[PDB]
Write a protein that binds this DNA or RNA. Structure first.
Ligand code: MG
Ligand code: MG
Ligand code: NA
Ligand code: NA
Ligand code: NA
Ligand code: NA
Ligand code: NA
Ligand code: NA
Ligand code: NA
Ligand code: NA
Ligand code: NA
Ligand code: NA
Ligand code: NA
Ligand code: NA
Ligand code: NA
Ligand code: NA
Ligand code: NA
Ligand code: NA
Ligand code: NA
Ligand code: NA
Ligand code: PT
Ligand code: PT
Ligand code: ZN
Ligand code: ZN
Ligand code: ZN
Ligand code: ZN
Lengths: 142, 142
DNA sequence: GAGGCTTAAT
DNA sequence: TAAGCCTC
DNA sequence: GAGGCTTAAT
DNA sequence: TAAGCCTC
């Protein structure tokens, strides 16, 4: 129910981080996507507006490989490369040879994203995802 | 059918590397295991002799998670962190909290070893392994 | 002949 | 974690 | 308020 | 790849 000072959207608490960040998850994920694309030499055909509509809202976000919810993934307490608790789902370039685009983008948790790496196709990763989903369901996580 | 200058064993060509290394795969893997254990603060209850018997020979080695053969994995042309073609299977500490030991050791290809990381139990990874095995069998690799 | 190294792509 | 390079 | 950063564990 | 820190 707070407004994000970056996108100006009116949003629930679950669209924000638990730490000292003032940006919403959509804005921070968009910033990362942009910086990452340029750093790695990947094209980016999303605009911020299309990305934000694509990214939707926290309670609707689930990893497209293992099915874990954003809240479920948050409860794993995974850390990012700077050492902070990961609290949102990221974006997989389905075809790892292609860039970020509406057609090539798939929502993915950081565990599945790193697993898939540039080793497995999306099709192959669909299969790994079901196996990962069984680990979560085995731990009591949705 | 060549002797390894380090262990003194009489061994087939498939127990040696394709590059400029003079050490056999068993000797190089043992060296890595020792250095890795000390670098990471893991115990190591293998002796070189028990490790070499445990490690066996190339044609018998298959990853304990995905089932890929050492030759199959070699054909993937994966690279190690120094940038060289990986030509042998490595060792997973089943319980990632425990060190290297006959009881805790499992043979694993570098793909499954990195996937399992310290995220999944051996039991959970058994399940991911079957899914990874389907990717290989789908590519025509045993 | 011995053995320290640097660290995927995501 | 993993194979070759480079200094011993 | 904008946006560059550093890089799991194996 | 991903969230907070720190310099603008
Ligand atoms: Mg990806
Ligand atoms: Mg392991
Ligand atoms: Na909401
Ligand atoms: Na991103
Ligand atoms: Na554009
Ligand atoms: Na979703
Ligand atoms: Na963690
Ligand atoms: Na945490
Ligand atoms: Na599966
Ligand atoms: Na399980
Ligand atoms: Na032989
Ligand atoms: Na090893
Ligand atoms: Na000992
Ligand atoms: Na085996
Ligand atoms: Na490769
Ligand atoms: Na190669
Ligand atoms: Na499975
Ligand atoms: Na397949
Ligand atoms: Na890298
Ligand atoms: Na590290
Ligand atoms: Pt941020
Ligand atoms: Pt070597
Ligand atoms: Zn925002
Ligand atoms: Zn996932
Ligand atoms: Zn040897
Ligand atoms: Zn494997």
């Amino acid at each position: 129910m707070t407004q994000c000072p970056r996108c100006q959207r009116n949003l629930a608490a679950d669209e924000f981080y638990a730490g000292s960040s003032k940006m919403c998850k959509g804005c921070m994920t968009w910033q990362n996507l942009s910086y990452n694309a340029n750093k790695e030499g990947h094209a980016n055909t999303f605009t911020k507006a299309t990305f934000l509509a694509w990214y939707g809202l926290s309670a609707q976000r689930h990893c497209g490989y293992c099915g874990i919810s954003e809240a479920g993934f948050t409860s794993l307490h995974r850390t990012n490369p700077r050492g902070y608790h990961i609290q949102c789902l990221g974006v997989d370039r389905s075809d790892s040879f292609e860039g970020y685009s509406p057609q090539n983008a798939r929502l993915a948790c950081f565990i599945c994203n790193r697993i898939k790496s540039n080793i497995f196709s999306a099709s192959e990763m669909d299969v790994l995802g079901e196996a990962i989903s069984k680990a979560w369901h085995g731990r009591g996580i949705a």
